[PDB]
Amino acid sequence: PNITNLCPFDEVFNATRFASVYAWNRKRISNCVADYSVLYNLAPFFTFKCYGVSPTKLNDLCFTNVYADSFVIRGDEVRQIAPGQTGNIADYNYKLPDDFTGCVIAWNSNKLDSKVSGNYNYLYRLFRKSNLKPFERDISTEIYQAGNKPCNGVAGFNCYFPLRSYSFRPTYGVGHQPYRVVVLSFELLHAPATVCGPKKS
Amino acid sequence: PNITNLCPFDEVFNATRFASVYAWNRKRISNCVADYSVLYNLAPFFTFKCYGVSPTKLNDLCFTNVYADSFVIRGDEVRQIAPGQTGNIADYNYKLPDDFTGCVIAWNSNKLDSKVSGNYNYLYRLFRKSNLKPFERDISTEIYQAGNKPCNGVAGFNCYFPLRSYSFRPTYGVGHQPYRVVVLSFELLHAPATVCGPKKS
Amino acid sequence: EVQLVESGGGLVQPGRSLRLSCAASGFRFDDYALHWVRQAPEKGLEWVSGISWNSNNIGYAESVKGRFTISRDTAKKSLYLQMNDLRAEDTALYYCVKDRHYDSSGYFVNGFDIWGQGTLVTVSAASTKGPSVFPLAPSSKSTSGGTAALGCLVKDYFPEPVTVSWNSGALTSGVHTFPAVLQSSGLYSLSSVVTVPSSSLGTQTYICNVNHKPSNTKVDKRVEPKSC
Amino acid sequence: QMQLVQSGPEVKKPGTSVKVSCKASGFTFTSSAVQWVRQARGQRLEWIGWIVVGSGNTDYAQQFQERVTITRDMSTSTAYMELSSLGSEDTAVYYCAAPNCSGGSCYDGFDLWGQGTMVTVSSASTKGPSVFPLAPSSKSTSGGTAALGCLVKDYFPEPVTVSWNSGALTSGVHTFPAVLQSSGLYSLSSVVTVPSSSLGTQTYICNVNHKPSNTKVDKKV
Amino acid sequence: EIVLTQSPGTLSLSPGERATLSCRGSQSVRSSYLGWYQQKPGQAPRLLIYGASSRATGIPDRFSGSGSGTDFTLTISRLEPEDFAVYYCQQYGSSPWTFGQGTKVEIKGTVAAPSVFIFPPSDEQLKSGTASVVCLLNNFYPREAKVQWKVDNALQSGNSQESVTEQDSKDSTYSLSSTLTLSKADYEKHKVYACEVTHQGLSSPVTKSFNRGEC
Amino acid sequence: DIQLTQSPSFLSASVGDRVTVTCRASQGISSYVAWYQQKAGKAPTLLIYTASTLQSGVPSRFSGSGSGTEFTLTISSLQPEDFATYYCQQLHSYPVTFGQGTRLDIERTVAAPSVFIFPPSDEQLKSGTASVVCLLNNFYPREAKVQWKVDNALQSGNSQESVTEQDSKDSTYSLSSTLTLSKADYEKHKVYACEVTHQGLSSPVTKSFNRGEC
Ligand SMILES: *[C@@H]1O[C@H](CO)[C@@H](O[C@@H]2O[C@H](CO)[C@@H](O[C@@H]3O[C@H](CO)[C@@H](O)[C@H](O)[C@@H]3O)[C@H](O)[C@H]2NC(C)=O)[C@H](O)[C@H]1NC(C)=O
Ligand SMILES: *[C@@H]1O[C@H](CO)[C@@H](O[C@@H]2O[C@H](CO)[C@@H](O)[C@H](O)[C@H]2NC(C)=O)[C@H](O)[C@H]1NC(C)=O
């Protein structure tokens, strides 16, 4: 147990840019040892609401694989991201499943994702015909036919663009300030669980 | 054995409210005559698997003393009340001795233990030092520090509140339905023979 | 290591377009923003153009707006600045600098991190012209405290290679090489002088060497004290 | 039920600004649109703009620009319009129209319409109305019919009610719409025709009521 | 700018008849992006036709819509007393949204001779410093009338205010009040005041005249 | 756009001194400012961003502060490597513009300049132009003004001034001023002179060469 092959947890967190909430990024981590301590190396106020597992007893037990997803959302949306809660972003973008066993880390990023004129690099979906199944990716940019009459691919009355951008400015309050969220979802399969945590002495 | 005053086997089972699982109550019943028919006659009884004693021979035999307990358990975690089985509730809230000689019963309480918004009168423990001694009463509410940081009560991260509250909703599934659970632990000393059941002369 | 290489500079006659290329090494090309900044000689600095991660936020300075075009290609990691309608203001040294926050000004953290060595661009309608050497004859007015100052005056040369040495490099003490000064006629000029003892006038030889590679002209001039 | 309610009548000074509210109830407001149309008295309808509730995107007509703003609120489920640089030409009735939506489907036409808000912009102040008796006479008699009446003049707040003998006589009663005079005060007339045999027999009284000035005048004619 | 125009200025008819109302557009619009609205005075307008081809909830089949391109038509199979109102057609697809002028449908029977009355100003108004002379016309079927004011056999214009009453629900009659207002001295220095009507219902124009010397 | 101004343009300094530079804007730019240091003929490098946050690998002598429309940079201790040009950049709006720049200087004692004048050469005269050059050398205060007068009449608008960089030996300065005139215009005058006004000498030197005298 030389403790040498650490997991690449820096790329997920220490990233210059984060993917939009409507099109999030998925990365798999395997064949390494976790270093959850680094989790509290930074950020002033960073919640760790681990549902389904003991928040402080995760190092000891070994897991088959871990999945990492990340995005950027508003203030109340970090509350809306809790499993089982119903919300427009919740039922239109991510839709965490009810039987979820993983942690959710949400931290303020006003210093790193706010523009004086107003940022336009972040988009989020407004409305969809049907709700999303858990762990589903939607990147469709087609027009929306709210009514029965076809839109024929042109905007106007009863035909709206599905994606609306945010506007992050420093003058806004805490509720409208940007927040970065990363979710870790653990899994257990027939594999020999090569994601064993650190061992001491 | 003379003296035929009936034991108060209606207060514990028929009560307006039950305390939290962490703070369970113990009633010592003595100097009376048992009436086991009422227990399984009125209330619809599920999971009456008595441990070490046949339920059909409860009446004739004379016992030493009887203790009554009652609480509310999460529907999925109803199996936690069994000797030789571990779990968060068993390790932190209430555990049963391996050399257990008694009976257990549980029944659904959707009518009385379900609110439109959610029940907040039920409280449980998420973590503690280690496994507790059999038949232990814990009233500890102080915050625990997982790390070496003495947060002395308040912390965004590295400290967690030991007490956690449930939330019961009528639209829940069968597994989410809280169950009122009553466990009887008996003594076979047979020295005083004070809790004899109904016998002639 | 992070490095930026710029190419395409040189000399351009007015009315002729040009394209400047910038290549990068040592970092993710399509995750970082880049800027082009020009500098005139002894004129501080001046921003020219900037670009973003996905070609969404681009803007030009009003002074050069409508005449320059910025483009970026992540396939080969290249940044192109296409020039149009060049005028007398375009002669400068250009730096291809890299920004550290995927976007232009507005964020809390922003700063030009890595500056390239830059490339030189000259704009004029002219052509090679061999320099002319004139003698600066020492005299009584040039003698002060036993030291006499003498030199040469190089003039009328369009390109800017200049090497001036005294006695074919044997004499290098007391010589000052003033920087070139652009006249109103468009031809640059410079003067260089050397301080020598007054008693050494007429007994020690002075050799004034000039060199101009594009015009392949090398003129040596003899300068002697004036005769009265 | 699907209902739309606007604000009450507004009186403003020229050069000021007016805010008009419009709230909806009984349907999915967050998946609809609001269209604002103002109409003068007996004139052509015109369009001012429209806002989408889903994204807040707004559109305005070229004629009405630099003085019209539109906002919305989901929590109160209410839209609001703001008009600046008020003048005499802004006195009109405003309507908010929306296409109703039972569930996830919305009608292709604007179904729900508000009750309308009357906005009047003038520099005149509230003042009691004046009554002038058009009494019956021989000059008003022709073939056994005599026409008499009452004139209500010189009042700034438009709402004025005229009744004959506290509602005793209604046949042959015609009240005429008010007209704006150069003085900035309104004036209207009410006329009733009676048989020539009934003149001089029973007293004729006209009651004029002016709610903003709280004026009630019973004039004998 | 898509301008709309309604050819029929009026649609005076009788109950139980069939009415055709056509509104024309300057340029072509979307096929199914036109609407038809009905409005009565003093009330909020109500939609009649949506989608340029369909009918909204609660509207009987008597109202039908058709047309395309730059011209649309609407047909009323049977006329009813509650159908007399103002109709509007508006666009839905182009960036600007506009309305037509609006066609008023009315009821016309037979032309009748109106009753004409004239009132010189009351003593109370004379004491108030002004004088208003009122010429009133009643019971005339056609809406349009012409009244001329003559003071001392001289035409007067620019000082007359006209007020008209809507259709009467019992005999379909109209009213008309023309008031001429003047100052005390100006009214007093002249003698003869008259209102003359050349209403088409009347065979010949009739004038009502009086003199200030007998008032 | 946004205008930025630095008050002290040139600051003579020595080792171990304390130096402070102030860069101020017109409109409040919050704290989106940065400072750059450009060496002699080298690409500038970033030192501080947001006026308080050191970036990386920068010596602790550099420091900065700022609020509202004021921004001040400070160096606790000076080393020979720190002598360079300093620029301040604003980042509030998009049309970013730098300052006029500030350059530190070494410290000497005042030095008396030496003046020389060269009459136009015959070969240069044959080309059709006449140039008279007045020379300034070995003066420590670079601030100086050279005046050209012909026939005791001040001449301006036809002379050019050139100055070299500070020497690494004596750390002084040398200035060369040239007055350009055509051949035909040369002979109508009789007196040609150059005037020097500098802190080195209490009175300005008046030296002239006679065209008609060898
Ligand atoms: C993202 O990158 C930054 C910059 O490299 C990281 O910030 C610093 O990360 C270290 C992790 O070791 C934090 O702990 C420090 O470790 C050194 C190791 O010798 C120790 O000497 C220090 O006393 C300290 O414990 C350090 O606090 C942190 N800096 C700040 C200002 O918080 C950051 O951790 C990276 N994020 C990741 C890897 O998720
Ligand atoms: C196993 O991993 C340890 C991690 O601590 C490595 O550290 C070595 O520790 C020994 C103990 O004295 C040193 O002698 C070695 O020099 C350390 N390694 C290096 C590269 O410096 C080491 O890789 C492994 N430990 C041993 C004892 O081999």
Side-chain angles (χ1 to χ4, degrees):
Chain A
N2 296 114
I3 313 160
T4 61
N5 197 259
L6 285 172
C7 293
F9 269 108
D10 178 83
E11 305 323 294
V12 183
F13 288 76
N14 263 335
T16 64
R17 39 143 33 176
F18 273 103
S20 296
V21 55
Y22 85 96
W24 40 274
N25 274 342
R26 173 165 289 274
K27 174 143 201 272
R28 68 180 65 252
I29 301 299
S30 68
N31 281 48
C32 59
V33 56
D35 45 356
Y36 295 114
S37 167
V38 187
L39 268 294
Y40 64 91
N41 271 343
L42 56 87
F45 271 9
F46 41 131
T47 53
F48 238 69
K49 355 192 138 109
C50 238
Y51 311 96
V53 290
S54 172
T56 186
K57 297 321 179 52
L58 284 171
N59 47 308
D60 62 358
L61 72 173
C62 299
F63 291 164
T64 300
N65 262 323
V66 295
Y67 277 133
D69 301 328
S70 67
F71 42 82
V72 58
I73 62 171
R74 286 219 293 210
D76 300 334
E77 275 82 324
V78 310
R79 177 198 44 75
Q80 283 202 2
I81 211 65
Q85 188 274 331
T86 79
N88 49 328
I89 181 161
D91 68 359
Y92 284 146
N93 299 121
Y94 195 31
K95 190 59 169 323
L96 264 173
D98 63 358
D99 50 352
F100 178 51
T101 46
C103 244
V104 259
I105 336 282
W107 60 307
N108 201 307
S109 48
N110 170 58
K111 185 177 71 68
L112 207 66
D113 267 328
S114 183
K115 204 189 192 165
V116 181
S117 161
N119 199 343
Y120 281 150
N121 295 40
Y122 292 159
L123 276 297
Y124 87 98
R125 213 185 282 269
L126 292 172
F127 39 83
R128 178 173 171 164
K129 185 48 75 153
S130 296
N131 276 1
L132 271 74
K133 308 313 279 213
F135 284 140
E136 193 165 323
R137 293 255 322 268
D138 206 2
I139 62 170
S140 194
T141 80
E142 313 212 31
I143 211 63
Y144 197 91
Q145 296 196 2
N148 51 3
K149 290 311 288 203
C151 289
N152 295 334
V154 297
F157 164 77
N158 189 27
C159 297
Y160 317 84
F161 194 78
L163 293 146
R164 187 178 70 89
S165 69
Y166 297 93
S167 55
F168 299 110
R169 298 180 178 95
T171 78
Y172 279 154
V174 55
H176 299 159
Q177 265 174 47
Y179 274 82
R180 290 176 163 195
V181 176
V182 54
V183 55
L184 285 158
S185 161
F186 314 93
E187 282 181 336
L188 277 191
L189 276 297
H190 293 167
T194 177
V195 192
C196 277
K199 323 289 264 170
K200 313 288 185 178
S201 195
Chain B
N2 45 37
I3 301 308
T4 60
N5 45 0
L6 273 297
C7 306
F9 273 117
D10 210 2
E11 295 175 352
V12 185
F13 313 81
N14 266 349
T16 69
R17 205 73 81 170
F18 287 166
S20 297
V21 57
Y22 86 95
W24 61 271
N25 63 7
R26 184 157 56 104
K27 307 310 152 195
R28 326 152 170 181
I29 297 89
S30 71
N31 205 344
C32 58
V33 55
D35 49 354
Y36 294 120
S37 84
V38 180
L39 319 173
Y40 56 77
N41 269 326
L42 162 72
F45 67 98
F46 292 165
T47 316
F48 195 50
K49 183 170 70 175
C50 291
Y51 300 133
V53 173
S54 304
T56 185
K57 64 186 180 156
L58 294 174
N59 184 347
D60 47 352
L61 307 176
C62 288
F63 316 144
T64 289
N65 270 323
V66 64
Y67 291 158
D69 189 358
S70 180
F71 38 85
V72 173
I73 297 303
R74 170 68 159 75
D76 278 327
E77 281 160 335
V78 76
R79 59 88 173 173
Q80 287 284 322
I81 311 301
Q85 299 173 1
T86 178
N88 56 5
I89 277 166
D91 291 331
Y92 307 133
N93 291 317
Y94 183 79
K95 73 154 296 292
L96 279 77
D98 198 309
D99 62 358
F100 184 110
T101 57
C103 295
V104 65
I105 199 58
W107 61 79
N108 210 317
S109 56
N110 214 350
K111 184 62 221 83
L112 282 171
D113 293 336
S114 181
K115 294 332 211 173
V116 62
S117 58
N119 286 101
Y120 312 126
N121 294 319
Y122 293 144
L123 183 63
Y124 83 102
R125 205 63 47 92
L126 261 188
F127 55 96
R128 214 192 60 78
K129 194 33 52 183
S130 193
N131 302 325
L132 284 157
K133 62 155 168 204
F135 299 139
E136 194 271 337
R137 284 289 310 278
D138 47 351
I139 199 55
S140 57
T141 60
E142 281 305 80
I143 189 166
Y144 182 76
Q145 303 64 30
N148 78 100
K149 189 51 74 192
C151 57
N152 63 63
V154 293
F157 187 45
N158 302 118
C159 293
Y160 332 102
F161 206 73
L163 316 174
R164 294 263 164 282
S165 164
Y166 283 161
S167 165
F168 294 145
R169 194 186 52 208
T171 72
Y172 277 171
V174 58
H176 296 262
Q177 288 219 38
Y179 292 165
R180 288 175 192 264
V181 186
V182 166
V183 60
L184 276 297
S185 167
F186 264 103
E187 308 166 10
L188 277 296
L189 294 174
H190 212 284
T194 315
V195 287
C196 282
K199 283 200 283 286
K200 214 262 181 183
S201 70
Chain C
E1 188 183 6
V2 59
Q3 295 277 53
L4 277 300
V5 178
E6 51 274 6
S7 62
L11 176 61
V12 165
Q13 206 167 4
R16 296 278 330 267
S17 67
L18 206 71
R19 170 164 274 175
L20 275 300
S21 306
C22 178
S25 168
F27 69 96
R28 285 90 71 79
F29 193 85
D30 67 329
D31 287 281
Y32 274 20
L34 283 72
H35 301 257
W36 271 93
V37 174
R38 88 186 166 183
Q39 155 172 349
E42 291 255 350
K43 292 289 308 305
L45 277 167
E46 174 158 323
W47 176 70
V48 166
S49 173
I51 190 167
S52 92
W53 94 275
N54 59 352
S55 262
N56 184 26
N57 185 231
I58 66 154
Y60 301 144
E62 181 36 34
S63 85
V64 301
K65 208 204 177 70
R67 312 171 321 131
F68 295 161
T69 290
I70 192 71
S71 70
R72 211 155 90 119
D73 187 18
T74 185
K76 66 181 77 67
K77 301 181 31 188
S78 295
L79 185 68
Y80 312 100
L81 182 58
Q82 162 187 355
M83 321 205 68
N84 280 129
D85 196 359
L86 282 73
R87 63 171 58 96
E89 291 179 10
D90 290 307
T91 176
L93 195 76
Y94 290 66
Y95 306 109
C96 173
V97 67
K98 177 257 289 180
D99 186 74
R100 45 175 273 158
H101 206 246
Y102 83 95
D103 186 74
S104 63
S105 64
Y107 292 89
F108 277 6
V109 294
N110 276 109
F112 293 157
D113 189 358
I114 302 308
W115 294 67
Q117 272 322 299
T119 181
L120 182 52
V121 169
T122 313
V123 63
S124 292
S127 122
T128 67
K129 260 102 211 164
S132 173
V133 192
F134 307 107
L136 303 179
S139 70
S140 57
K141 294 264 160 66
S142 58
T143 47
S144 176
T147 308
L150 58 88
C152 305
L153 188 153
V154 168
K155 195 259 162 183
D156 186 74
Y157 62 97
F158 181 68
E160 282 302 327
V162 162
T163 64
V164 176
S165 62
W166 282 110
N167 288 348
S168 73
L171 181 59
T172 48
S173 181
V175 55
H176 295 285
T177 305
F178 290 89
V181 164
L182 176 54
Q183 317 169 310
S184 279
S185 62
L187 275 297
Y188 309 91
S189 178
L190 62 85
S191 306
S192 185
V193 291
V194 59
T195 48
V196 289
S198 58
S199 56
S200 63
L201 287 178
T203 185
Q204 189 274 331
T205 57
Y206 313 100
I207 290 310
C208 197
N209 310 106
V210 75
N211 191 358
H212 193 176
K213 296 290 182 67
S215 80
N216 57 61
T217 303
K218 277 76 69 177
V219 174
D220 215 324
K221 192 59 180 177
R222 298 294 296 163
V223 181
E224 288 284 332
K226 77 175 303 190
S227 65
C228 290
Chain D
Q1 202 171 359
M2 283 73 74
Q3 285 182 356
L4 265 294
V5 176
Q6 294 171 244
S7 58
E10 294 294 328
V11 178
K12 297 278 193 174
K13 189 74 73 181
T16 57
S17 70
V18 57
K19 199 77 178 295
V20 187
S21 68
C22 168
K23 69 97 173 179
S25 61
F27 72 96
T28 313
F29 192 34
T30 50
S31 75
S32 61
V34 162
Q35 185 178 3
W36 278 111
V37 285
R38 91 166 161 62
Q39 186 193 348
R41 198 211 213 172
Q43 293 305 125
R44 317 193 51 197
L45 285 167
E46 61 275 359
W47 173 60
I48 296 91
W50 67 298
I51 183 175
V52 299
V53 191
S55 67
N57 201 1
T58 71
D59 191 76
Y60 302 104
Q62 53 75 10
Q63 50 266 66
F64 297 159
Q65 283 180 354
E66 300 85 37
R67 50 197 282 255
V68 288
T69 316
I70 298 181
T71 179
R72 67 171 165 71
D73 184 62
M74 305 171 230
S75 82
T76 50
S77 297
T78 310
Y80 315 92
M81 65 179 288
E82 180 38 55
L83 183 63
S84 59
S85 299
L86 280 171
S88 57
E89 69 275 16
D90 291 331
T91 77
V93 191
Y94 289 70
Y95 297 92
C96 53
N100 73 6
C101 309
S102 82
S105 313
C106 292
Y107 274 59
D108 304 72
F110 280 75
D111 262 357
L112 301 171
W113 279 66
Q115 77 268 19
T117 294
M118 183 278 288
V119 176
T120 310
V121 179
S122 171
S123 55
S125 179
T126 303
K127 192 255 291 181
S130 300
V131 61
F132 289 95
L134 191 140
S137 296
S138 63
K139 299 184 175 181
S140 54
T141 51
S142 292
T145 301
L148 72 164
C150 293
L151 317 176
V152 187
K153 196 179 172 283
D154 279 297
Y155 63 91
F156 156 73
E158 162 85 359
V160 164
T161 306
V162 180
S163 63
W164 275 112
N165 285 351
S166 307
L169 271 299
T170 48
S171 180
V173 167
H174 291 86
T175 184
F176 284 41
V179 287
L180 174 59
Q181 300 168 130
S182 56
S183 66
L185 304 183
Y186 302 115
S187 63
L188 64 89
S189 306
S190 183
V191 57
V192 65
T193 61
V194 288
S196 70
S197 56
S198 300
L199 64 94
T201 56
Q202 63 84 30
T203 178
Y204 298 82
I205 315 290
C206 68
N207 321 119
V208 55
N209 189 359
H210 191 196
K211 315 266 199 213
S213 70
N214 203 34
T215 306
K216 182 66 177 178
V217 182
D218 300 332
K219 184 71 174 185
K220 66 184 289 184
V221 298
Chain E
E1 181 49 86
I2 301 299
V3 189
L4 300 181
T5 305
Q6 288 79 74
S7 53
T10 180
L11 211 50
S12 310
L13 272 191
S14 303
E17 292 190 295
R18 203 218 41 75
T20 298
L21 188 153
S22 303
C23 83
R24 185 157 30 250
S26 59
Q27 307 164 29
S28 173
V29 293
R30 306 290 179 89
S31 298
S32 309
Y33 268 55
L34 188 152
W36 280 103
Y37 293 76
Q38 179 175 10
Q39 185 194 37
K40 271 162 301 305
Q43 303 186 17
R46 188 212 39 222
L47 188 138
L48 285 188
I49 301 299
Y50 82 105
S53 61
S54 63
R55 190 174 294 109
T57 304
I59 297 89
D61 49 0
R62 46 179 152 162
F63 307 99
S64 55
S66 66
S68 65
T70 64
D71 187 75
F72 263 58
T73 58
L74 188 153
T75 306
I76 297 89
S77 50
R78 296 295 86 193
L79 209 44
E80 278 82 48
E82 59 91 20
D83 290 332
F84 299 95
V86 180
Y87 301 119
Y88 293 111
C89 62
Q90 69 168 353
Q91 65 195 314
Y92 264 120
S94 64
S95 178
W97 299 344
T98 49
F99 295 79
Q101 284 85 245
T103 295
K104 181 165 208 166
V105 55
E106 299 146 346
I107 179 169
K108 185 161 291 313
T110 175
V111 287
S115 299
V116 190
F117 273 121
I118 183 64
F119 212 82
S122 67
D123 305 340
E124 296 87 7
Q125 193 185 18
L126 188 140
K127 289 175 188 173
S128 81
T130 49
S132 305
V133 286
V134 181
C135 200
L136 162 70
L137 270 76
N138 204 329
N139 300 325
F140 44 101
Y141 273 61
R143 176 58 147 76
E144 183 64 31
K146 284 294 282 154
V147 61
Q148 295 177 333
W149 278 99
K150 296 181 181 180
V151 181
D152 272 28
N153 285 341
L155 73 165
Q156 286 300 311
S157 176
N159 210 353
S160 69
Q161 292 191 302
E162 166 57 38
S163 193
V164 62
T165 312
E166 279 203 81
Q167 287 190 172
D168 220 335
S169 55
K170 64 90 176 179
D171 291 331
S172 297
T173 71
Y174 285 164
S175 295
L176 177 137
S177 166
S178 182
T179 175
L180 181 84
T181 303
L182 211 64
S183 75
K184 185 191 288 183
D186 189 358
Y187 160 68
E188 286 176 345
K189 66 180 183 293
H190 287 170
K191 299 288 95 176
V192 186
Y193 294 80
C195 52
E196 176 193 80
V197 62
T198 181
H199 183 254
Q200 57 274 17
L202 297 165
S203 51
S204 69
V206 185
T207 180
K208 282 293 181 185
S209 66
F210 285 98
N211 200 324
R212 209 181 64 86
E214 202 64 30
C215 289
Chain F
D1 66 80
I2 301 299
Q3 313 78 69
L4 262 63
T5 314
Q6 310 153 48
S7 177
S9 182
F10 293 93
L11 283 72
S12 176
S14 66
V15 191
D17 291 331
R18 178 47 83 84
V19 62
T20 307
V21 61
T22 313
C23 178
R24 65 165 318 279
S26 68
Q27 179 184 18
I29 52 186
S30 185
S31 286
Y32 322 127
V33 307
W35 299 74
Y36 298 91
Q37 180 212 20
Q38 177 165 41
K39 281 281 190 317
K42 202 60 73 211
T45 79
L46 174 57
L47 287 180
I48 315 174
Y49 64 97
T50 73
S52 43
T53 315
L54 190 145
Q55 169 160 259
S56 176
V58 176
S60 291
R61 61 206 86 154
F62 298 119
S63 71
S65 179
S67 66
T69 73
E70 189 206 279
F71 293 99
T72 58
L73 189 135
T74 301
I75 296 101
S76 67
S77 300
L78 269 75
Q79 314 291 104
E81 190 276 331
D82 303 67
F83 296 101
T85 310
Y86 293 99
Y87 299 100
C88 54
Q89 161 204 45
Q90 61 92 25
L91 286 163
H92 187 116
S93 293
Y94 189 15
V96 292
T97 44
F98 298 171
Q100 72 261 11
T102 304
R103 183 182 68 188
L104 269 297
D105 208 308
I106 324 275
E107 171 68 61
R108 218 244 228 257
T109 30
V110 63
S114 304
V115 55
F116 309 98
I117 188 164
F118 292 165
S121 67
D122 67 318
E123 293 184 17
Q124 200 271 331
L125 285 167
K126 288 170 189 172
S127 74
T129 57
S131 294
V132 292
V133 175
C134 183
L135 194 145
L136 268 70
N137 221 335
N138 53 48
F139 52 95
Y140 158 55
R142 69 172 303 279
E143 61 274 15
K145 185 33 52 183
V146 54
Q147 313 74 40
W148 285 100
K149 64 173 70 175
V150 173
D151 288 355
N152 285 346
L154 188 153
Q155 290 298 320
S156 77
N158 273 115
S159 68
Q160 291 183 117
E161 293 179 353
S162 184
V163 60
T164 191
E165 271 305 270
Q166 190 178 25
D167 291 331
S168 176
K169 316 162 91 163
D170 49 10
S171 327
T172 48
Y173 277 107
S174 301
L175 190 149
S176 165
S177 69
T178 303
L179 173 71
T180 300
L181 193 64
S182 65
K183 154 67 78 169
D185 294 340
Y186 177 46
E187 289 84 4
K188 65 182 181 293
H189 300 292
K190 188 269 183 181
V191 173
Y192 292 75
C194 74
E195 288 287 332
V196 182
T197 300
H198 184 241
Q199 295 85 17
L201 294 174
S202 51
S203 62
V205 61
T206 295
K207 176 250 293 177
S208 66
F209 82 100
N210 206 329
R211 190 186 55 90
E213 290 183 355
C214 191

